[model samples]
Target: KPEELRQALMPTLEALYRQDPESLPFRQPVDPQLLGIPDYFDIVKNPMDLSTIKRKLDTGQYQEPWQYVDDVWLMFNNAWLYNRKTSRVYKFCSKLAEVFEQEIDPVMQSL
Candidate 1:
């Protein structure tokens, strides 16, 4: 399921974003409002084993993970580029967005 795939990629995504190590999803619930995920899946936690999450992500259901990543990109872009804010953080986020797209392109091809 997409939800499971999203749950699986949470840890990997958090790592990519350089977030707190203890904030790995499935291990600890995070506020979806903060991340811009669908509210229905918000406030939920994944209780599956890490190995199981990995196996699921490696399967065809992986498309959901890609879509989830796309959503994150959209949200970040809106906040950092279109919000009309002129701050150092916006500049940093713009550059970070570039790097993220570059990195995810190769990853998507492999997956």
Candidate 2:
């Protein structure tokens, strides 16, 4: 079941995260226990078709598809904003740490 699910879904996810797809648990180890899902009834090649894997689940079983890439522009903007923010934060923190080296322990300071 895990293998089947991996076979069907892995390609899609791999395509989406081509650079380092394996870094994600759902892609690399593909454990049945991943995503808090104890087990999938089975891996359905075409869930849309309701074929290979078809079992009525509890009403709450369904959730939003995640749609991580839905807002490409917004995500890009957010990423850029966060990256800039973090870069500035890191630079300032490093400067502050350098200034207070004697007052603060290295382990307690962060860059």
Name the candidate that leads on lDDT: 1
Stretch of 10 with least lDDT, candidate 2: 49-58
- lDDT for each residue of candidate 1 in 1-111, tens digit (9 for 90 to 100): 665555556545544445333213322233456756564243222322233434545554457656556544544544453334675445545555565566666655654
Q: For residues 8-109, write the lDDT of model 2, one tens digit per residue.
A: 333333332332322222122223366453533253221121111111111222222222112222222332333344564234333332333332233223
Candidate 2 global TM-score: 0.21
Candidate 2: the clashing residue pairs are: none
lDDT, candidate 2, residue 14?
Answer: 35
Clashes of 2: 0
Candidate 2 segments whose C-alpha is farther than 4 A from its true place: 1-14, 21-70, 85-111
Estimate every model's Cα lDDT from 0 to 1: 0.47, 0.29
